[PDB]
Design an enzyme around this catalytic site. Sequence first.
Site, PDB file in Angstrom:
ATOM      1  N   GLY A   1       3.404   1.960  -1.607  1.00 51.21           N
ATOM      2  CA  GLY A   1       4.067   2.093  -2.911  1.00 51.21           C
ATOM      3  C   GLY A   1       5.001   0.929  -3.152  1.00 51.21           C
ATOM      4  O   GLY A   1       4.615  -0.196  -2.787  1.00 51.21           O
TER       5      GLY A   1
ATOM      6  N   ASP B   1       7.508   4.312  14.057  1.00 49.23           N
ATOM      7  CA  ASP B   1       7.083   3.056  13.417  1.00 49.23           C
ATOM      8  C   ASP B   1       8.240   2.025  13.419  1.00 49.23           C
ATOM      9  O   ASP B   1       8.512   1.390  12.405  1.00 49.23           O
ATOM     10  CB  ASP B   1       6.463   3.337  12.046  1.00 49.23           C
ATOM     11  CG  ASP B   1       5.745   2.132  11.460  1.00 49.23           C
ATOM     12  OD1 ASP B   1       5.339   1.254  12.248  1.00 49.23           O
ATOM     13  OD2 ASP B   1       5.609   2.063  10.197  1.00 49.23           O
TER      14      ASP B   1
ATOM     15  N   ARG C   1       0.852  -1.216   0.000  1.00 51.46           N
ATOM     16  CA  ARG C   1       0.000   0.000   0.000  1.00 51.46           C
ATOM     17  C   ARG C   1       0.891   1.271   0.000  1.00 51.46           C
ATOM     18  O   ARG C   1       0.497   2.246  -0.632  1.00 51.46           O
ATOM     19  CB  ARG C   1      -0.944  -0.115   1.207  1.00 51.46           C
TER      20      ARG C   1
ATOM     21  N   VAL D   1       9.462  -0.448  -3.530  1.00 47.62           N
ATOM     22  CA  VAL D   1      10.919  -0.155  -3.455  1.00 47.62           C
ATOM     23  C   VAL D   1      11.600  -0.956  -4.565  1.00 47.62           C
ATOM     24  O   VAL D   1      11.257  -2.165  -4.745  1.00 47.62           O
ATOM     25  CB  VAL D   1      11.523  -0.426  -2.070  1.00 47.62           C
ATOM     26  CG1 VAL D   1      13.015  -0.143  -2.063  1.00 47.62           C
ATOM     27  CG2 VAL D   1      10.779   0.359  -1.011  1.00 47.62           C
TER      28      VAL D   1
HETATM   29  C1  LIG Z   1      12.137  -0.397   4.958  1.00 47.09           C
HETATM   30  O1  LIG Z   1      12.105   0.790   4.147  1.00 47.09           O
HETATM   31  C2  LIG Z   1      12.952   0.960   3.075  1.00 47.09           C
HETATM   32  C3  LIG Z   1      13.865   0.004   2.656  1.00 47.09           C
HETATM   33  C4  LIG Z   1      14.686   0.264   1.567  1.00 47.09           C
HETATM   34  C5  LIG Z   1      15.640  -0.809   1.137  1.00 47.09           C
HETATM   35  C6  LIG Z   1      16.990  -0.491   1.163  1.00 47.09           C
HETATM   36  N1  LIG Z   1      17.915  -1.423   0.812  1.00 47.09           N
HETATM   37  C7  LIG Z   1      17.543  -2.639   0.405  1.00 47.09           C
HETATM   38  C8  LIG Z   1      16.190  -3.036   0.349  1.00 47.09           C
HETATM   39  C9  LIG Z   1      15.930  -4.480  -0.088  1.00 47.09           C
HETATM   40  C10 LIG Z   1      16.787  -5.048  -1.016  1.00 47.09           C
HETATM   41  C11 LIG Z   1      16.649  -6.377  -1.397  1.00 47.09           C
HETATM   42  C12 LIG Z   1      15.635  -7.191  -0.895  1.00 47.09           C
HETATM   43  C13 LIG Z   1      15.508  -8.628  -1.318  1.00 47.09           C
HETATM   44  C14 LIG Z   1      15.881  -8.898  -2.794  1.00 47.09           C
HETATM   45  C15 LIG Z   1      16.479 -10.288  -3.051  1.00 47.09           C
HETATM   46  N2  LIG Z   1      16.142 -11.260  -1.992  1.00 47.09           N
HETATM   47  C16 LIG Z   1      14.688 -11.476  -1.847  1.00 47.09           C
HETATM   48  C17 LIG Z   1      16.717 -10.879  -0.700  1.00 47.09           C
HETATM   49  C18 LIG Z   1      16.415  -9.420  -0.361  1.00 47.09           C
HETATM   50  C19 LIG Z   1      14.765  -6.650   0.028  1.00 47.09           C
HETATM   51  C20 LIG Z   1      14.945  -5.302   0.468  1.00 47.09           C
HETATM   52  C21 LIG Z   1      15.221  -2.061   0.705  1.00 47.09           C
HETATM   53  C22 LIG Z   1      13.738  -2.407   0.611  1.00 47.09           C
HETATM   54  C23 LIG Z   1      14.635   1.480   0.958  1.00 47.09           C
HETATM   55  C24 LIG Z   1      13.714   2.456   1.394  1.00 47.09           C
HETATM   56  O2  LIG Z   1      13.611   3.699   0.784  1.00 47.09           O
HETATM   57  C25 LIG Z   1      14.291   3.920  -0.480  1.00 47.09           C
HETATM   58  C26 LIG Z   1      12.864   2.185   2.442  1.00 47.09           C
HETATM   59  O3  LIG Z   1      11.947   3.126   2.871  1.00 47.09           O
HETATM   60  C27 LIG Z   1      12.355   4.157   3.751  1.00 47.09           C
END
Ligand SMILES: COc1cc(-c2cncc(-c3ccc(C4CCN(C)CC4)cc3)c2C)cc(OC)c1OC
Lengths: 283, 290
Positions: free
Chosen positions: A19, A133, A17, A21
């Site tokens: 959006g 949060d 919800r 990443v």
């Molecule tokens: C919580 O919030 C935010 C998080 C992020 C963020 C930063 N680095 C890496 C991630 C990420 C990378 C990779 C995977 C998977 C892909 C492959 N496999 C399944 C293992 C792992 C998951 C997550 C994220 C999501 C950025 C944000 O803002 C730009 C966020 O919001 C503030």
Amino acid sequence: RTVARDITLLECVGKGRYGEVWRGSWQGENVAVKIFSSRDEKSWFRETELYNTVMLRHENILGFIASDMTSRHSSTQLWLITHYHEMGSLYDYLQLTTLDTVSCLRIVLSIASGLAHLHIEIFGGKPAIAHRDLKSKNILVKKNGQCCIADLGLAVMHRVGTKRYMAPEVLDETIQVDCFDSYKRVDIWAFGLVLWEVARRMVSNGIVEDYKPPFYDVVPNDPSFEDMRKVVCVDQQRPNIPNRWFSDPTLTSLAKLMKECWYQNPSARLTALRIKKTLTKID
Amino acid sequence: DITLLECVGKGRYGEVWRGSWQGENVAVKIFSSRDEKSWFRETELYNTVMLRHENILGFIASDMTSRHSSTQLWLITHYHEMGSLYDYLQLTTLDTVSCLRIVLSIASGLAHLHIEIFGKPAIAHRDLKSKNILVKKNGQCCIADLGLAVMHSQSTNQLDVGNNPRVGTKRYMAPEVLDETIQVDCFDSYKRVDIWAFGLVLWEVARRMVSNGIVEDYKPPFYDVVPNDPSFEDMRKVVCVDQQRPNIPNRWFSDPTLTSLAKLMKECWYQNPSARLTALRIKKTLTKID
Ligand SMILES: COc1cc(-c2cncc(-c3ccc(C4CCN(C)CC4)cc3)c2C)cc(OC)c1OC
Ligand SMILES: COc1cc(-c2cncc(-c3ccc(C4CCN(C)CC4)cc3)c2C)cc(OC)c1OC
Ligand SMILES: COc1cc(-c2cncc(-c3ccc(C4CCN(C)CC4)cc3)c2C)cc(OC)c1OC
Ligand SMILES: COc1cc(-c2cncc(-c3ccc(C4CCN(C)CC4)cc3)c2C)cc(OC)c1OC
């Protein structure tokens, strides 16, 4: 001069919800791009306003790169660009990974370090900040074994929080909303729940608990505000501490710590700085 | 890629560049760190899709970028090669048709800002002046710089005054701004400050309209009565203590257009803010004048 602006979006690593990443590329380097839904534009504005006030730079805070607003025909596109952590969220990591004493303490002390950095006002400096949060999905794992805290969309400087992690004073609406320290004490409650999530995954005497979210045994998935209020406020339940923890000095100390984050009376809870001191004296 | 090609403005605010992006000229404003609250406020304003209007400077992107301890603040807009109205009036005189086209376009933009769309909140600008108006090749103008704007929603009874210590350009400040009696919690107060400033811009423009072979040189408001680079207190002296208003050149009274404009700018300059004309009434009056 040339301003090479374009980010290539390469793969979606989260959709909700809020959006989406994306892993993106800029000048040959990974970045993380959060694309906001219309529903959650205020989270982009709050995090942008905070970073326009104070450029936070800390090893245990997700690293800011940019806030972008782009005009479209019939809409506004809002992106937050940050450092990229390929190991993903702590929530993600704890599902399959187990921990030893050193890796458990390094994770929780890194989170306490990021949280104390947010909480403490520095003169000359930074305002005091409460997160509002904190949860394992809002913490990323770094390759060096430390974590960093993400998502300042609800942060307050001196949308509601995730209901599963709400402190009793939020659920019973007694929180002193004019007292900044109230917001710190709400984060400390949430920290204690995260400390419980991590400690379950630490092996001792060949035993480990499966990953579960806080209160998994007493509320449904997507618990209602009422579901949570009955558990936390009316019955005053707290997460279970398994017997096997009391055979392990680290988990015995972590159980005491998490209990001191969960007092009904918010002013009795430990401060982030006191949690750091306690964690440095374990092992 | 955005290419920065030449600096077209530099001051305490920051600087503006003419750039190229996706094969079009763009304007790139880089804010001074001293004015970071204007960057954020302008970004809140441009978030509104229904702000877009032929007489408001069109937005392309807004960015905050950072590495380590340094932050850059960028606003990217459409580029107007003819520059500001202030620049344009220095060197060009106007005929009747051109003068009315310029001032009606500014009135059109200001009425668009002031009137709520049910969306776009009602918006008061708070720094209207000839440097903050750009001249377009079609002979109309567009209003720029929404860093000080105030927003109001009638449906929800919400007033958003923002967080910006910046104040309006001293030369263009209304009496109630200079004497600090303005009612800060009243949206209509901010609209009436814009109407004062609009009257001053009308006067600056009308001076450059030829009648009967006569025109005045370009001068900024109150040029004759304050020091160069007037202070807040310099302006409070002439506007509030001395009760000064710009003089109407007597040659205007031989020309029906300039006679109508003198009447209109005087109805923007009442000391009683509630006596002043609305932006919509000004637009309607200019639509009827020839
Ligand atoms: C919580 O919030 C935010 C998080 C992020 C963020 C930063 N680095 C890496 C991630 C990420 C990378 C990779 C995977 C998977 C892909 C492959 N496999 C399944 C293992 C792992 C998951 C997550 C994220 C999501 C950025 C944000 O803002 C730009 C966020 O919001 C503030
Ligand atoms: C606008 O938008 C984006 C811009 C960029 C970007 C690309 N190249 C160079 C830059 C840069 C940084 C800093 C300066 C300084 C140099 C020292 N001087 C005294 C002041 C100015 C100049 C240029 C940027 C900021 C990246 C983006 O995303 C990765 C952007 O999109 C959000
Ligand atoms: C937004 O993010 C990134 C930006 C950049 C980047 C690109 N061009 C120029 C710069 C820059 C140069 C010089 C100054 C000056 C400031 C004042 N004084 C005179 C000393 C130094 C500031 C900024 C940067 C920082 C690179 C990045 O990665 C390598 C970025 O990270 C993704
Ligand atoms: C007011 O405010 C903003 C204005 C602009 C902007 C947009 N098109 C054109 C211009 C311009 C070009 C050229 C000259 C010439 C005229 C005088 N002489 C011949 C040398 C210089 C003047 C002005 C500007 C300044 C962009 C902004 O943001 C990106 C503004 O801020 C919102």
